[PDB]
């Protein structure tokens, strides 16, 4: 199937408390693999996945230097945006960026992306064509004009189609035992009473990877996505994920409801009952 390399970058100013906090977190698919945090003593790029032990010391030195340079670029951007938006220097503001590429099973590029946000709202983003930008407001339009004059899209496109894709292929090769594995979900149902003649049935799916999964509740063969309650799929601390979905049913009629679990590690979907 397809695979992705994504970097989540955050710069947060803190007036009166020194320099902004700067963080970079990288993921290959749903697995965290590298991280940089300016608030750590002796800030350096660090491995977050076991297979990254395969890179030499040169890799860490180069990524650390790049991170420090990027940190400084965002310090300047925070000041620049205060000007664009005519805001005071006493408040905290945030810049967020998501950067990355996706490749198919054959390793060829499927899509690239680079999106920025300021204080939690869209700022500017590279369009799917990897040639033009989409600006959310007049401040971002200033940035758009600067980037067009500097040829930023061409520079970024070269990174997305070249460097990004080539390194993603390498990470998938080196971490194959971890990244190309499939951990099948193990499920079970819990039961809880309610004040009125009804009960809550909760279906749990545990220990699976990758993260994509589908949990549904059925009645007479009809899906109850409309009356279903659930949580977003979440990490469980060891590289696997979990999720649950619940429905409220009449007491004494719990046997008519079934939970269905669909996942890459389930040749045939699971069907559970209380």
């Amino acid at each position: 199937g397809p695979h992705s390399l994504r970097y989540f970058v955050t710069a947060v100013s803190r007036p009166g408390l020194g320099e902004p906090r700067y963080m970079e977190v990288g993921y290959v698919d749903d697995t965290e693999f590298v991280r940089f945090d300016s608030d750590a003593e002796n800030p350096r790029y660090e491995p977050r996945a076991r297979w990254m032990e395969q890179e030499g010391p040169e890799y860490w030195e180069r990524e650390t230097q790049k991170a420090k340079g990027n940190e400084q670029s965002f310090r300047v951007d925070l000041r620049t945006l205060l000007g664009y938006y005519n805001q005071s220097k006493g408040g905290s503001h945030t810049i967020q960026v998501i950067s990355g590429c996706e490749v198919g099973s054959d390793g060829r590029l499927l899509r690239g992306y680079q999106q920025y946000a300021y204080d939690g709202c869209d700022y500017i983003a590279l369009n799917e064509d990897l040639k033009t930008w989409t600006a959310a407001d007049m401040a971002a339009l200033i940035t758009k004009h600067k980037w067009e004059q500097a040829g930023e899209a061409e520079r970024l496109r070269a990174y997305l189609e070249g460097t990004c894709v080539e390194w993603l292929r390498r990470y998938l090769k080196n971490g194959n035992a971890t990244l190309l594995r499939t951990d099948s979900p193990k499920a079970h149902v819990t039961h809880h009473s309610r004040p009125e003649d009804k009960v809550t049935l909760r279906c749990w799916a545990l220990g699976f990877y990758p993260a994509d999964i589908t949990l549904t509740w059925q009645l007479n063969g009809e899906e109850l996505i409309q009356d279903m309650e659930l949580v977003e799929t979440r990490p469980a601390g060891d590289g696997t994920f979990q999720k649950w979905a619940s429905v409220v049913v009449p007491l004494g009629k719990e046997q008519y409801y079934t939970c269905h679990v669909y996942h890459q590690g389930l040749p045939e979907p699971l069907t559970l009952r209380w």
């Binding site: 990027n70 670029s73 951007d77 500017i124 990174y159």
Partner: peptide, 9 residues
């Protein structure tokens, strides 16, 4: 691997 030498905002 991370990108670098980006154009400022």
């Amino acid at each position: 691997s991370r990108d670098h030498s980006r154009t400022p905002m």
